[PDB]
Design a protein around this ligand. Structure first.
Ligand SMILES: [Mg+2]
Ligand SMILES: [Mg+2]
Ligand SMILES: [Mg+2]
Ligand SMILES: [Mg+2]
Ligand SMILES: [Mg+2]
Ligand SMILES: [Mg+2]
Ligand SMILES: [Mg+2]
Ligand SMILES: [Mg+2]
Ligand SMILES: [Mg+2]
Ligand SMILES: [Mg+2]
Ligand SMILES: [Mg+2]
Ligand SMILES: [Mg+2]
Ligand SMILES: [Mg+2]
Ligand SMILES: [Mg+2]
Ligand SMILES: [Mg+2]
Ligand SMILES: [Mg+2]
Ligand SMILES: [Mg+2]
Ligand SMILES: [Mg+2]
Ligand SMILES: [Mg+2]
Ligand SMILES: [Mg+2]
Ligand SMILES: [Mg+2]
Ligand SMILES: [Mg+2]
Ligand SMILES: [Mg+2]
Length: 63
RNA sequence: UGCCCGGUGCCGGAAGGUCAAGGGGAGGGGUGCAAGCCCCGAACCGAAGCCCCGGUGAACGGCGGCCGUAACUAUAACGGU
């Protein structure tokens, strides 16, 4: 239910009463998009850098 | 109680430009036999105002546009002009 109320002349009011329909239909019609997710790139270098130094100095003791 | 003094206003500026009456008369003219009488008149000097230089917003006022860009969507902290 749409009401186009502001012009003196009706056929302008219809021009606007209509397009409030059509452009409203488009908004509720087209919805977001593809795609997700991205996956991690440098976990090969980065985290096996941290498993490098971790294993080495781990052969120590104590605390 | 923020930013903008280009514009308008007001305030300041003993320089410069313009600028009226008036001063000044180079030079020209009417007339008379002539002394002369009469009229134009350049340079130049000659206010305020305006120009020009600045100040000023609790003075009048004014406080943008397009385009791109992030863990794919969105959006754009970031950029470009
Ligand atoms: Mg996504
Ligand atoms: Mg250790
Ligand atoms: Mg202990
Ligand atoms: Mg203010
Ligand atoms: Mg600001
Ligand atoms: Mg600024
Ligand atoms: Mg101003
Ligand atoms: Mg001003
Ligand atoms: Mg000024
Ligand atoms: Mg200035
Ligand atoms: Mg002025
Ligand atoms: Mg003044
Ligand atoms: Mg001087
Ligand atoms: Mg002067
Ligand atoms: Mg004179
Ligand atoms: Mg005289
Ligand atoms: Mg003569
Ligand atoms: Mg004669
Ligand atoms: Mg004179
Ligand atoms: Mg003078
Ligand atoms: Mg003056
Ligand atoms: Mg203005
Ligand atoms: Mg994206």
């Amino acid at each position: 239910v749409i009401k186009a109320q502001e012009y003196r002349s009706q056929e302008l009011n219809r021009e606007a009463a209509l397009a409030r329909l059509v452009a409203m239909i488009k908004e509720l019609t087209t919805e977001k998009k593809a795609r997700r997710p991205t996956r991690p790139t440098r976990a090969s270098k980065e985290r096996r850098l941290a498993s490098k130094a971790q294993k080495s100095s781990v052969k120590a003791m104590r605390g």
